């Protein structure tokens, strides 16, 4: 056979850095049921910023090795952020059942991307009790993957309707998390950031830090 002696790589000409900071360094995250979404395009993305931080504890990725992020190039990257309880983080997984998975935020079975969760007791805990966060409790059925359900209709699931007034046999579907620093780790609020990679053959926009070289012909 003939072994090569040369090796080349060509990447897009863009060099500007895009704001991963405004997703992670945001002062306050939106409610889990109405989870915020930020899209990222046309930049070079460095993942060494996220990886080397100690508090970013729960960093487990589906379909992509976390170490290989530094060189892969993606068409587009989505960022979703919200606030959930300590024991509720394990419920963020494709094909797994659970309250937020059922009614708040579900990952599709064919999901690709990484999920990041870290402790947030130093911002989302009030001694009297925080109620700025809401989570949906009642819904007729499971929510579709990557869907945001902000419906505020008063739930009736029984044989006698109330016709939309919270009298007998009707509850408001949205319940507020009661975060307090005294509670244990199992209920201690956490901040979660979910990255979805649209890995495809289309002309990509977001790439990892890499250096191009001369294009060898023959």
């Amino acid at each position, epitope marked *: 056979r003939v072994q090569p002696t040369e090796s080349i790589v060509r990447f897009p000409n863009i060099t500007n850095l895009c704001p991963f900071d405004e997703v992670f360094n945001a002062t*306050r995250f939106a409610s889990v049921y109405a989870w915020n979404r930020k899209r990222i395009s046309n930049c070079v993305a460095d993942y060494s910023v996220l990886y080397n931080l100690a508090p970013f504890f729960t960093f487990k990725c589906y379909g992509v090795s976390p170490t290989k992020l530094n060189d892969l190039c993606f068409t587009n990257v989505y960022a979703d952020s919200f606030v959930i309880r300590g024991d509720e983080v394990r419920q963020i997984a494709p094909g797994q059942t659970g309250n937020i998975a059922d009614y708040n935020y579900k990952l599709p079975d064919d999901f690709t991307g990484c999920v990041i969760a870290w402790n947030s*007791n*130093k*911002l*989302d805990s009030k*001694v009297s009790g*925080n109620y700025n966060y809401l989570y949906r409790l009642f819904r007729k059925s499971n929510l579709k993957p990557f869907e945001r359900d902000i419906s505020t209709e008063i739930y009736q699931a029984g044989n006698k309707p109330c016709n939309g007034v919270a009298g007998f046999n009707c509850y408001f579907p949205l319940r507020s998390y009661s975060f307090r*620093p005294t509670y244990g780790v199992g209920h201690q609020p956490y901040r979660v950031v979910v990255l979805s990679f649209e890995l495809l053959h289309a002309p990509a926009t977001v790439c990892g830090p890499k250096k191009s070289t001369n294009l060898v012909k023959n």
Partner: antibody
Amino acid sequence: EVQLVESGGGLVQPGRSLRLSCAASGFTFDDYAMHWVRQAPGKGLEWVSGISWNSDSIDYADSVKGRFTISRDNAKNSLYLQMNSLRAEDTALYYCAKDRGYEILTPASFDYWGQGTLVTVSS
Amino acid sequence: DIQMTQSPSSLSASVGDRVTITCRASQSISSYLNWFQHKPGKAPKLLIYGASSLQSGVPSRFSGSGSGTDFTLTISSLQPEDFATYYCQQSYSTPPYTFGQGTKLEIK
């Protein structure tokens, strides 16, 4: 590197009312909490009042309940502290500290500070 | 109700030494304590937020430690600008943002 300038200090008679203002320019102001803290002439720092990112949650120190009012105006990126019903032991130094989070009573503490403005209550 | 007391009031050292200061809590505060550096010539600033987390922009020489009831700040270099007064604060219990007594640090 943020700038927190304070004014309105001076000397007033007991029972009289004066005003404090603190202007913030080195950081985004509409989503940060703020606190007013007191430095005694010969004792340590003592917390006085606080305000959330929006004027929704308000807390006062125990020693000054029902005497001071803390106001915040986002349009001019400044907060005001109205001083009412003063006594002879509020002659300390008052600092304008900035909280890290957005609530009022959180594990987060005072992040950046500013120069204090002296106040004296006597004749 | 919480109480914080500092064993040292005035500490003596030199330019090239190291000294330690402890802050005790009357009741457990779940490691939510902060150390504030207070020069007498200018506005005080924070050094250590949380139990042992260093706030960005201050020299790495300062390092917080301790969790629960007893907390400690340590300094190893003592550059000649470290003459100041240090305070410990708790932010967990219902008496909000109570402070500890001063800790005068002097260089011999």
